Design an enzyme around this catalytic site. Structure first.
Site, PDB file in Angstrom:
ATOM      1  N   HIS A  17      -1.589   4.293  -0.627  1.00  0.00           N
ATOM      2  CA  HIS A  17      -2.042   5.345   0.050  1.00  0.00           C
ATOM      3  C   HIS A  17      -1.209   6.984  -0.091  1.00  0.00           C
ATOM      4  O   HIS A  17      -1.334   7.506   1.645  1.00  0.00           O
ATOM      5  CB  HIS A  17      -1.911   5.035   1.697  1.00  0.00           C
ATOM      6  CG  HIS A  17      -3.154   4.026   1.875  1.00  0.00           C
ATOM      7  ND1 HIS A  17      -3.282   3.628   3.026  1.00  0.00           N
ATOM      8  CD2 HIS A  17      -3.937   3.321   1.029  1.00  0.00           C
ATOM      9  CE1 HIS A  17      -4.461   2.580   3.406  1.00  0.00           C
ATOM     10  NE2 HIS A  17      -5.172   2.456   1.898  1.00  0.00           N
TER      11      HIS A  17
ATOM     12  N   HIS B 119      -4.765  -7.392  -3.921  1.00  0.00           N
ATOM     13  CA  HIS B 119      -4.259  -6.458  -2.982  1.00  0.00           C
ATOM     14  C   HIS B 119      -4.597  -6.885  -1.754  1.00  0.00           C
ATOM     15  O   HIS B 119      -3.597  -7.098  -0.637  1.00  0.00           O
ATOM     16  CB  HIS B 119      -5.153  -5.525  -2.861  1.00  0.00           C
ATOM     17  CG  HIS B 119      -5.411  -4.252  -2.136  1.00  0.00           C
ATOM     18  ND1 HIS B 119      -6.709  -4.018  -1.441  1.00  0.00           N
ATOM     19  CD2 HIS B 119      -4.213  -3.404  -1.695  1.00  0.00           C
ATOM     20  CE1 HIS B 119      -6.026  -2.556  -0.414  1.00  0.00           C
ATOM     21  NE2 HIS B 119      -4.790  -2.511  -0.489  1.00  0.00           N
TER      22      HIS B 119
ATOM     23  N   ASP C 118       1.058  -1.222  -0.607  1.00  0.00           N
ATOM     24  CA  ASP C 118       0.223   0.375   0.092  1.00  0.00           C
ATOM     25  C   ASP C 118       1.070   0.908   0.030  1.00  0.00           C
ATOM     26  O   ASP C 118       2.140   1.087   0.231  1.00  0.00           O
ATOM     27  CB  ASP C 118      -1.511  -0.007   1.440  1.00  0.00           C
ATOM     28  CG  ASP C 118      -2.071  -1.020   1.391  1.00  0.00           C
ATOM     29  OD1 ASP C 118      -2.876  -0.986   0.495  1.00  0.00           O
ATOM     30  OD2 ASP C 118      -2.120  -2.111   2.671  1.00  0.00           O
TER      31      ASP C 118
ATOM     32  N   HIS D 137      -2.015  -4.649   2.686  1.00  0.00           N
ATOM     33  CA  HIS D 137      -3.408  -4.200   3.203  1.00  0.00           C
ATOM     34  C   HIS D 137      -3.706  -3.910   4.668  1.00  0.00           C
ATOM     35  O   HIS D 137      -4.585  -3.307   5.203  1.00  0.00           O
ATOM     36  CB  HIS D 137      -5.035  -5.321   2.669  1.00  0.00           C
ATOM     37  CG  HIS D 137      -6.226  -4.507   3.157  1.00  0.00           C
ATOM     38  ND1 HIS D 137      -7.144  -5.299   3.548  1.00  0.00           N
ATOM     39  CD2 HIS D 137      -7.188  -3.881   3.111  1.00  0.00           C
ATOM     40  CE1 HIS D 137      -8.105  -4.810   3.579  1.00  0.00           C
ATOM     41  NE2 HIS D 137      -7.919  -3.494   2.723  1.00  0.00           N
TER      42      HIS D 137
ATOM     43  N   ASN E 105      -9.010  -2.072  -3.168  1.00  0.00           N
ATOM     44  CA  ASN E 105     -10.147  -1.484  -2.756  1.00  0.00           C
ATOM     45  C   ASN E 105     -10.881  -0.546  -2.737  1.00  0.00           C
ATOM     46  O   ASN E 105     -12.024  -0.159  -2.447  1.00  0.00           O
ATOM     47  CB  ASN E 105     -10.459  -2.783  -1.126  1.00  0.00           C
ATOM     48  CG  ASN E 105      -9.751  -1.882  -0.123  1.00  0.00           C
ATOM     49  OD1 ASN E 105      -8.403  -0.777   0.132  1.00  0.00           O
ATOM     50  ND2 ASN E 105      -9.786  -2.767   1.374  1.00  0.00           N
ATOM     51  N   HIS E 106      -9.638   0.658  -2.167  1.00  0.00           N
ATOM     52  CA  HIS E 106     -10.305   1.945  -2.439  1.00  0.00           C
ATOM     53  C   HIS E 106     -10.034   2.495  -3.647  1.00  0.00           C
ATOM     54  O   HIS E 106     -10.491   3.675  -3.640  1.00  0.00           O
ATOM     55  CB  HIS E 106      -9.600   2.931  -1.935  1.00  0.00           C
ATOM     56  CG  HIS E 106      -9.631   2.281   0.154  1.00  0.00           C
ATOM     57  ND1 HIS E 106     -10.026   3.666   1.417  1.00  0.00           N
ATOM     58  CD2 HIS E 106      -9.297   1.703   1.013  1.00  0.00           C
ATOM     59  CE1 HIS E 106     -10.290   3.457   2.417  1.00  0.00           C
ATOM     60  NE2 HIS E 106      -9.978   2.137   2.497  1.00  0.00           N
TER      61      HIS E 106
ATOM     62  N   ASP F 194      -6.518   7.845  -1.118  1.00  0.00           N
ATOM     63  CA  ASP F 194      -7.081   7.169   0.405  1.00  0.00           C
ATOM     64  C   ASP F 194      -5.884   7.871   1.213  1.00  0.00           C
ATOM     65  O   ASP F 194      -5.233   6.437   1.531  1.00  0.00           O
ATOM     66  CB  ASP F 194      -7.395   5.872   0.631  1.00  0.00           C
ATOM     67  CG  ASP F 194      -7.901   5.405   1.716  1.00  0.00           C
ATOM     68  OD1 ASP F 194      -8.227   6.056   2.578  1.00  0.00           O
ATOM     69  OD2 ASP F 194      -6.877   4.641   1.962  1.00  0.00           O
ATOM     70  N   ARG F 195      -6.177   8.426   2.679  1.00  0.00           N
ATOM     71  CA  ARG F 195      -5.185   8.630   3.497  1.00  0.00           C
ATOM     72  C   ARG F 195      -4.272   9.567   3.402  1.00  0.00           C
ATOM     73  O   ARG F 195      -4.011  11.036   3.614  1.00  0.00           O
ATOM     74  CB  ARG F 195      -5.072   7.280   4.526  1.00  0.00           C
ATOM     75  CG  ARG F 195      -6.282   6.347   4.975  1.00  0.00           C
ATOM     76  CD  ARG F 195      -7.144   7.406   5.966  1.00  0.00           C
ATOM     77  NE  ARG F 195      -7.900   6.390   5.722  1.00  0.00           N
ATOM     78  CZ  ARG F 195      -8.577   6.644   7.153  1.00  0.00           C
ATOM     79  NH1 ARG F 195      -9.177   8.210   7.997  1.00  0.00           N
ATOM     80  NH2 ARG F 195      -9.760   5.544   7.486  1.00  0.00           N
TER      81      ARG F 195
ATOM     82  N   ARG G 195     -14.962  -5.378   8.853  1.00  0.00           N
ATOM     83  CA  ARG G 195     -15.682  -4.714   8.148  1.00  0.00           C
ATOM     84  C   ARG G 195     -16.928  -4.716   7.806  1.00  0.00           C
ATOM     85  O   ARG G 195     -16.814  -3.672   6.941  1.00  0.00           O
ATOM     86  CB  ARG G 195     -14.459  -5.586   6.339  1.00  0.00           C
ATOM     87  CG  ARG G 195     -12.731  -5.168   7.621  1.00  0.00           C
ATOM     88  CD  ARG G 195     -12.187  -3.604   7.903  1.00  0.00           C
ATOM     89  NE  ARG G 195     -11.130  -3.988   7.919  1.00  0.00           N
ATOM     90  CZ  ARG G 195     -10.216  -2.623   7.864  1.00  0.00           C
ATOM     91  NH1 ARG G 195     -10.896  -1.148   7.791  1.00  0.00           N
ATOM     92  NH2 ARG G 195      -8.969  -3.030   7.996  1.00  0.00           N
TER      93      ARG G 195
ATOM     94  N   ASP H  60      -4.336   0.838  -3.714  1.00  0.00           N
ATOM     95  CA  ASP H  60      -4.183   2.016  -2.789  1.00  0.00           C
ATOM     96  C   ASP H  60      -3.069   3.393  -2.373  1.00  0.00           C
ATOM     97  O   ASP H  60      -2.451   3.377  -1.877  1.00  0.00           O
ATOM     98  CB  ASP H  60      -3.915   1.487  -1.085  1.00  0.00           C
ATOM     99  CG  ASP H  60      -5.216   1.094  -0.472  1.00  0.00           C
ATOM    100  OD1 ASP H  60      -5.830   0.753  -1.353  1.00  0.00           O
ATOM    101  OD2 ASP H  60      -5.507   0.636   0.167  1.00  0.00           O
TER     102      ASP H  60
END
EC number: 3.1.3.16
Lengths: 564, 125, 157, 353
Positions: free
Chosen positions: D82, D189, D80, D271, D140-141, D111-112, D244, D108
Site C-alpha cells: 500500500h 491476495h 500488502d 488483504h 484487488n486495488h 492505494d493509500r 464489502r 497492493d
C-alpha cells in the site's frame, strides 16, 4: 421485498384478527378471494397461496374463532393436495407452512386432534400408495411435497406467541427457507398406540434401500432425458430418521413391547450403518440413532454397557462425537450409579485425548466448543451425583488440584472456575477454591487467574469481596506492569456487573478512599467511577464521610487541572 | 370578513411568539387565497370600491408575516411576495369610481390604506 | 423550434434515471437528474426525483425539504404529498398526516397507496374498523390498476 | 533568514534533470538499482519515456510468463505494501537483499500510500534484474475502479502523465493471478472462490483485462477469512460479505476440503491489516507486511519465510517516510480558497459600516 399486495393482505388479516368478535361476512370475503374447487382438481398461483397463508394467520391469531367454517375448507384442500395443478421448490415450502398451521391449530384445541391426525395418516397413506405404484410430475412435485410435509410432522411450540406468527413478523425465518433439512427446535398429546404403530410401519417401509436405488435410477433417467434435487436417498434417509427421533422424543408411559421393538430397530439400523461407513449426511442420522438408543434405555445394566461402548468409541463425525458426549451426559444425569464410571473417562479425556490436541493443532515464531461442552457435562454430572454421595466432589477437586501441581493448567483453571461459579448453592466450597488460587501464583497465567477471580467476584459475597479488595489494593499500591491493565479491566467488569446495592455503595466509597489515598496516569479510575455512577439516581443526602471524600476528590481534580 | 380578519390578526400576533405550528396553518391559509391572475375577469376577489378594507388588511397581514423572520427557506418567500404584488396590481385594472359607503366606515379605510403604504415603503430586503 | 422537444428530452432523462432509482445506484441517478435539471431548474418533477435520491441515501431532512419545495410549486401533485405524509407519520407527528391524506383523497380517489397510508395512520389511533374498510378499498382499487394512467391518449376531435 | 534561499538547507534539492535510460540501465540493459533506489528514496522522478519503457517491457515479461508460476521453496513471502516505499525498503532489509533472497509479493503496491509510483518503479527494476526469481502478484486495488477512485491517478498526473497512468494500469492488468507453492500452498491476495476447486480453474482464466465485477478472479482478489474462527456452526462454504458488497467469505470446512482434495497444506494470503503483522487461524495463515497502516494504525509488519516445510514468521517495525499533503495537492489549490474567503470577509466588513 414482500411487495404491496402481500403486505396489505397481511395487514388486513392482522387487523381482522384483533377485532373480537369479527363479523362473519368479512371472513366470507376472505374465503372468497381464497381458491375454490374445480371438479376435484385445484390450481395455484402466488396470490392464491398468499391468500391461504393470510387466512391461516388470521385463524391462528383470532383466538380460535369461526373454526367450524374454515377448518373444513382446509381439510378439503389438503385432501385435494396430491393432484393440485402447479403454475427451493415452492411446493415443499407451501406444504411446510400448511402443516405448521394445522399442527398449531391441533395443539390449540383438543376436540379435533383425532380428526386432524387421522386425515394426516390418510394423506401420507395415499402418498405411500402412489410413490411405489409418468415420471416428470412425480419427481417434480410429489416427492418434494413429501419432504415438505415431512419437515414438520409433529413439531409444535409452547409459547405465548404462536409458531407461524414468529415465521412472518410485522415490519432468521429466511434461514428455514434456505437449507435442506432444517426444522423447529406439556400436555402430552393422546395419540392412540395404533397411529404410532402405523407411523412406525411407514418409517420401516420407507427406509428400504431397493426403493432408493430405483428412485435414483429413475431420477437419473429423467435428468438425462432432458430440477433442483440430485439424489433423494440421503435427504430422505436423514428426514425420516430426524422426525422419527423428534416425534417420539418426549413421550412417556408407553407399553414396553413398543419400546423394545423400536430399540431393536434403532440398534439394528445403527450397527448396520456403522459397519457400512468404515470404508456425509449419514452422520446426523447416526447421531439421531444414538439419541434414540439413549432414550430407549430403562435398566442400569444396559446403561453402563452403553457407557462402556461409548468410552471405547471416544479413545479411538464431529457432530457425531458431540452427540456422543451429550448422550453420555444424559446417561450420567439419568442414572447416578454410573457417575463413578463416567467421571474418570471424561476427566482423562479433558486432561490428556489426542483428538483435542489435534483440534488445537511446523509453527515456529522467532476446540473451545468441545471444551466447554465437556465442562458443562462435568457440572451436570456432579450436580446430579451430589444427591447420593456428598464426598465425591471433595475427592474430585482434590484430584484436579493434584493434576494442577503435577497449557493444561489453563484448562484446569478454567474448569475449576466453572465448577466454582456453577455451584454457588453449595456449602463452603469456594473458600478452598480461593485459597488454592491465591496459593497458586508462580507468570503469564496471572491474567487468566485474575479474570477467573473476577468472575468469582461477580457472584457477590462479602468475605471474598473483602479479600479480593485487599489483594487488588495491595497490587495497586505496589505501583507489575503486566498486572495493571489486567486489574483495571477486572474492576471495570466488576463495576459493570455488580447487582446488590449494599456492596455497590460500599465499593463506591472504598474506590473514593483509594482515589484519595492516591493523593501522594493517575486518573485512570474515573471511567470506572463514571460507569458505576451511571447506574444510580442523583445523590441528595448521604454520609458526611462521603461528602468529605467528594470534596477532596473535586479539589484534587481541579488542582491537577483536570476540570478545564 | 372585516371582523374575521381582525380575529385572525390578533391570534397570529400571539402565535408568532407562543408556538411554531400555527405558523404553517397561517401560511397555508394565506397562500391558497390569492392567485397570480391579474387580468380581465378572474382574480378570486371582488374589485368593487366598497370592498377595499378587507383586501388591504389581508395584504398587510401577509406583509407582516413576511417581515417577522419565521419562514425558514427562501423559495416560499418569493412566491408569497409575487402573489401579494400580483393582487395589489390586479386591484388597479378597472375604471375609477367614487365610494358609496356612508360617512362612517370611510375614515378607517383611508387609515388602512396609509398603513399599507407605510408598510410597503419600509420593505427593503 | 418549439419548447416541447426540450420537454421530451427532459422526460427521456427522467425516465432513464427512474430505472437507476429502482435498482439502488444513487450516483448515476444524481448525474442523470443534474443533467436533466440543467435545462429547467424549477420543475416540480425534478425536485421529486431529488427527494427520491435523498431518501434513498438515508436523510430524513433533505427529502422533507425537497418534497415541501416541490409541493410549493404545484399543489396538485399526489406523489409528493404521499411521500411527505409517509415520512411525517414515521417521524411522530400524527396530526398533519391525516389532513394531508384527506386532501389527497379529495383531489383524487383512485390511488390505492393513498388508502393504504390512510389506513396505516388510522391503525395507530384505534378506530381499526375504518382502517379495515380503507384496506378493503385499497385492495379492490388495486385489483384493476394499469401500467400508466389512461388519460395519456389525447382527447381531440 | 534569506527570503529567497531555502530555510532547511540540510535537505538536498532534488535534481531537475529527469534521468534518461542510459543513466539507469547499463550497457547490457540491467537497471542500476542502487542508484535508482537512492533516487526514489530521495523522491526523485524519472523521465516519462524511461518509466514507460520499464513498465511496458515488464508487462511484456509477465505476458510471456505462465498464469501459474512454479516457484520452488525457499522463499520470503510478503503481503500488502500500500505505497509504503520506505517500509518496502525495510522489508527488504529484514528479509535480505534480492541479490541473494527469493521474494514473492502478494500485491497492493498502490492505494493509500503516497509512494506508489516509487514502489512500482523499484519492483519493476527488481523484476528486470531477477525475472525468474522475483515475482509480483495482483491485488484487488490493481484496477481502474479503485485507482481512479483513490489518488494513484492524480499522483501519476502530477508526477508523470495520464497516459503513463494508463500504461501502468495495463501492466497491472498483465499481473498473474495465483501461485502454486511447493505443491502445497495456493498463494493469492484475497483468497478462495466457490468457482475454484483446482489450480487449473485459475490457469484457464483470461487475465488480460480490467477485473470484472464478479466471478472467481474477483473473489481471488477480494475475499476475506470470516470473523469467527473455530466456532463456525454455519454449514455454507461461502457466504455474502455484507461489508464489502461483493464476493464472499470462505469457511474453515471449505478450506479443509479444498486442501484435502488438492493435497495442499494451507493457503497464504494478505488483504487484512493485523496488529502483529500476521494471524494464524492449521488450515489458514494471513500475513500483512504494511506497518503503521495509513500512518495511524501503529501496526508492526511481518514476512513469512517458507523453507524446509517450515513457516518462520519474521516481524519488523515501521520506518520513517517523507510527508505528503493529502491527494498530492499543490499550495495554490490549498490556500487560494482561504485567501478569497478572507478578502471577501474584509471587504464586507469595510462596507457594512
Amino acid at each position: 421485498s414482500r411487495g404491496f399486495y402481500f403486505n396489505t393482505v397481511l395487514s388486513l388479516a392482522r387487523s381482522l384478527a384483533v377485532q373480537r368478535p369479527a363479523s362473519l361476512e368479512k371472513v366470507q370475503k376472505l374465503l372468497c378471494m381464497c381458491p375454490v374447487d374445480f371438479h376435484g382438481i385445484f390450481q395455484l398461483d402466488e396470490r392464491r397461496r398468499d391468500a391461504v397463508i393470510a387466512l391461516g394467520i388470521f385463524l391462528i391469531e383470532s383466538d380460535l374463532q369461526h373454526k367450524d367454517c374454515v377448518v373444513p375448507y382446509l381439510l378439503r384442500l389438503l385432501k385435494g393436495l396430491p393432484k393440485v395443478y402447479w403454475v427451493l421448490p415452492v411446493a415443499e415450502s407451501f406444504s411446510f407452512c400448511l402443516v405448521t398451521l394445522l399442527s398449531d391449530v391441533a395443539y390449540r384445541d383438543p376436540s379435533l386432534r383425532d380428526e386432524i391426525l387421522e386425515v394426516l395418516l390418510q394423506v401420507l397413506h395415499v402418498l405411500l400408495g402412489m410413490c411405489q405404484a409418468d415420471k416428470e410430475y412425480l419427481c417434480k412435485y410429489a416427492i418434494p411435497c413429501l419432504i415438505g410435509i415431512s419437515r414438520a410432522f409433529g413439531r409444535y411450540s409452547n409459547m405465548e406467541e404462536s409458531l407461524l406468527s414468529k415465521l412472518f413478523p410485522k415490519i432468521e425465518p429466511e434461514y428455514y427457507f434456505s437449507t435442506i433439512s432444517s426444522s423447529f427446535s406439556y400436555k402430552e398429546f393422546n395419540i392412540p398406540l395404533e397411529m404410532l404403530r402405523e407411523l412406525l410401519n411407514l418409517v420401516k417401509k420407507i427406509v428400504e434401500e431397493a426403493v432408493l436405488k430405483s428412485l435414483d435410477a429413475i431420477v437419473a433417467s429423467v435428468m438425462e432425458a432432458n430440477l433442483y434435487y440430485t439424489s433423494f436417498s440421503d435427504p430422505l434417509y436423514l428426514t425420516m430418521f430426524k422426525m422419527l427421533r423428534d416425534t417420539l422424543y418426549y413421550m412417556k408411559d408407553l407399553p414396553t413391547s413398543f419400546v423394545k421393538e423400536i430399540h431393536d430397530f434403532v440398534l439394528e439400523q445403527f450397527n448396520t450403518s456403522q459397519g457400512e461407513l468404515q470404508k456425509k449426511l449419514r452422520c446426523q442420522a447416526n447421531a439421531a440413532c444414538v439419541d434414540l438408543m439413549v432414550w430407549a434405555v430403562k435398566d442400569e445394566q444396559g446403561a453402563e454397557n452403553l457407557c462402556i461402548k461409548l468410552s471405547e468409541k471416544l479413545q479411538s463425525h464431529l457432530p457425531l462425537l458431540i452427540c456422543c458426549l451429550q448422550g453420555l451426559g444424559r446417561l450420567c444425569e439419568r442414572f447416578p450409579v454410573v457417575v463413578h464410571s463416567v467421571t474418570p473417562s471424561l476427566r482423562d479425556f479433558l486432561v490428556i485425548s489426542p483428538v483435542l490436541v489435534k483440534l488445537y493443532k511446523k509453527i515456529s515464531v522467532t476446540y473451545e466448543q468441545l471444551r466447554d461442552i465437556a465442562i458443562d457435562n462435568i457440572c451436570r454430572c456432579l450436580k446430579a451425583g451430589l444427591t447420593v454421595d456428598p464426598v465425591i466432589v471433595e475427592a474430585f477437586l482434590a484430584s484436579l488440584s493434584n493434576r494442577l501441581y503435577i497449557l493444561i493448567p489453563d484448562h484446569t483453571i478454567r474448569a475449576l472456575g466453572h465448577i466454582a461459579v456453577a455451584l454457588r448453592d453449595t456449602p463452603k466450597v469456594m473458600e478452598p477454591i480461593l485459597q488454592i488460587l491465591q496459593q497458586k501464583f508462580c507468570s503469564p497465567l496471572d491474567v487468566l487467574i485474575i479474570d477467573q477471580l473476577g468472575c468469582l467476584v461477580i457472584t457477590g459475597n462479602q468475605y471474598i469481596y473483602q479479600e479480593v479488595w485487599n489483594l487488588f489494593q495491595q497490587i495497586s499500591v505496589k505501583a507489575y506492569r503486566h498486572c495493571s491493565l489486567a486489574v483495571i479491566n477486572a474492576l471495570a467488569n466488576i463495576a459493570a456487573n455488580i447487582q446488590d446495592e449494599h456492596l455497590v455503595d460500599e465499593l463506591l466509597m472504598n474506590l473514593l478512599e483509594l482515589f484519595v489515598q492516591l493523593g501522594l496516569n493517575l486518573g485512570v479510575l474515573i471511567p470506572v467511577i463514571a460507569v458505576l455512577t451511571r447506574r444510580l439516581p442523583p445523590i441528595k443526602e448521604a454520609k458526611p464521610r462521603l461528602q468529605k471524600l467528594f470534596r477532596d476528590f473535586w479539589l484534587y481534580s481541579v488542582l491537577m487541572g483536570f476540570a478545564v | 370578513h372585516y371582523i374575521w380578519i381582525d380575529f385572525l390578526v390578533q391570534r397570529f400576533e400571539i402565535a408568532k411568539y407562543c408556538s411554531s405550528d400555527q405558523v404553517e396553518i397561517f401560511s397555508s391559509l394565506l397562500q391558497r387565497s390569492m392567485s397570480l391572475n391579474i387580468g380581465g375577469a378572474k382574480g378570486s376577489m371582488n374589485r368593487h370600491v366598497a370592498a377595499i378594507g378587507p383586501r388591504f388588511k389581508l395584504l398587510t397581514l401577509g406583509l407582516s408575516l413576511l417581515h417577522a423572520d419565521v419562514v425558514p427557506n427562501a423559495t416560499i418567500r418569493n412566491v408569497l411576495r409575487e402573489k401579494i404584488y400580483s393582487t395589489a396590481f390586479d386591484y388597479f385594472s378597472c375604471p375609477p369610481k367614487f365610494p358609496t359607503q356612508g360617512e362612517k366606515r370611510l375614515r378607517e379605510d383611508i387609515s388602512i390604506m396609509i398603513k399599507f403604504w407605510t408598510a410597503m415603503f419600509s420593505d427593503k430586503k | 423550434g418549439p419548447l416541447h422537444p426540450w420537454m421530451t428530452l427532459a422526460q427521456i432523462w427522467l425516465h432513464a434515471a427512474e430505472v437507476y432509482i429502482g435498482i439502488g445506484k444513487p450516483a448515476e441517478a444524481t448525474a442523470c437528474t443534474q443533467e436533466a435539471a440543467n435545462l429547467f431548474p424549477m420543475s416540480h418533477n425534478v425536485l421529486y426525483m431529488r427527494g427520491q435520491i435523498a431518501e434513498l441515501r438515508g436523510s430524513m431532512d433533505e427529502a422533507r425539504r425537497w418534497y415541501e419545495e416541490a409541493l410549493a410549486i404545484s399543489p396538485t401533485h399526489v406523489k409528493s404529498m404521499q411521500r411527505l405524509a409517509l415520512i411525517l407519520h414515521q417521524l411522530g407527528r400524527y396530526s398533519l398526516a391525516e389532513k394531508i391524506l384527506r386532501d389527497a383523497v379529495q383531489v383524487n380517489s383512485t390511488a390505492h397507496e393513498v388508502w393504504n397510508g390512510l389506513g396505516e395512520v388510522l391503525q395507530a389511533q384505534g378506530n381499526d374498523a375504518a382502517a379495515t374498510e380503507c384496506f378493503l378499498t385499497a385492495l379492490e382499487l388495486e385489483a384493476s390498476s394499469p401500467a400508466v394512467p389512461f388519460t395519456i391518449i389525447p382527447r381531440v376531435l | 533568514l534569506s527570503t529567497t534561499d531555502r530555510v532547511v538547507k540540510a535537505v538536498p534539492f532534488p535534481p531537475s534533470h529527469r534521468l534518461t535510460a542510459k543513466e539507469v540501465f547499463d550497457n547490457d540493459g540491467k537497471p542500476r538499482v542502487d542508484i535508482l533506489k537512492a533516487h526514489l528514496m530521495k523522491e526523485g522522478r524519472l523521465e516519462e519515456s524511461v518509466a514507460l519503457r520499464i513498465i511496458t517491457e515488464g508487462a511484456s515479461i509477465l505476458r510471456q510468463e505462465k498464469n501459474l508460476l512454479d516457484i520452488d521453496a525457499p522463499v520470503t513471502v510478503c503481503g500488502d505494501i500500500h505505497g509504503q516505499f520506505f517500509d518496502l525498503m525495510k522489508l527488504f532489509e529484514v528479509g535480505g537483499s534480492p541479490a541473494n533472497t527469493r521474494y514473492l509479493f502478494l500485491g497492493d503496491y498502490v492505494d493509500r500510500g503516497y509512494f506508489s509510483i516509487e514502489c512500482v518503479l523499484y519492483l519493476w527494476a527488481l523484476k528486470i534484474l531477477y525475472p525468474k526469481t522475483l515475482f509480483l502478484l495482483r491485488g484487488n486495488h490493481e484496477c481502474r475502479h479503485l485507482t481512479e477512485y483513490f489518488t494513484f491517478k492524480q499522483e501519476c498526473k502530477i508526477k508523470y502523465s495520464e497516459r503513463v497512468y494508463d500504461a501502468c494500469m495495463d501492466a497491472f492488468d498483465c499481473l498473474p493471478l495465483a501461485a502454486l507453492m511447493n505443491q502445497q500452498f495456493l498463494c493469492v491476495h484475497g483468497g478462495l472462490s466457490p468457482e475454484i476447486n483446482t489450480l487449473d480453474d485459475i490457469r484457464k482464466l483470461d487475465r488480460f483485462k480490467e477485473p470484472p465485477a464478479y466471478g472467481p478472479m474477483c473473489d481471488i482478489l477480494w475475499s476475506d477469512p470470516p470473523e469467527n474462527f473455530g466456532n463456525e456452526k454455519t454449514q455454507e462454504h461461502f457466504t455474502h460479505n455484507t461489508v464489502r458488497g461483493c464476493s464472499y467469505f470462505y469457511s474453515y470446512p471449505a478450506v479443509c476440503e479444498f486442501l484435502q482434495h488438492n493435497n495442499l497444506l494451507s493457503i497464504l494470503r494478505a488483504h487484512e491489516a493485523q496488529d502483529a503483522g500476521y494471524r494464524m487461524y492449521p488450515s489458514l495463515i494471513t500475513i500483512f507486511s504494511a506497518p503503521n497502516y495509513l500512518d495511524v494504525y501503529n501496526n508492526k509488519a511481518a514476512v513469512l519465510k517458507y523453507e524446509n516445510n517450515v513457516m518462520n514468521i519474521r516481524q519488523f517495525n515501521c520506518s520513517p517516510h517523507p510527508y505528503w499533503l493529502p491527494n498530492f495537492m499543490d499550495v495554490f489549490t490549498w490556500s487560494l480558497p482561504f485567501v478569497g474567503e478572507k478578502v471577501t470577509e474584509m471587504l464586507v466588513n469595510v462596507l457594512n459600516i
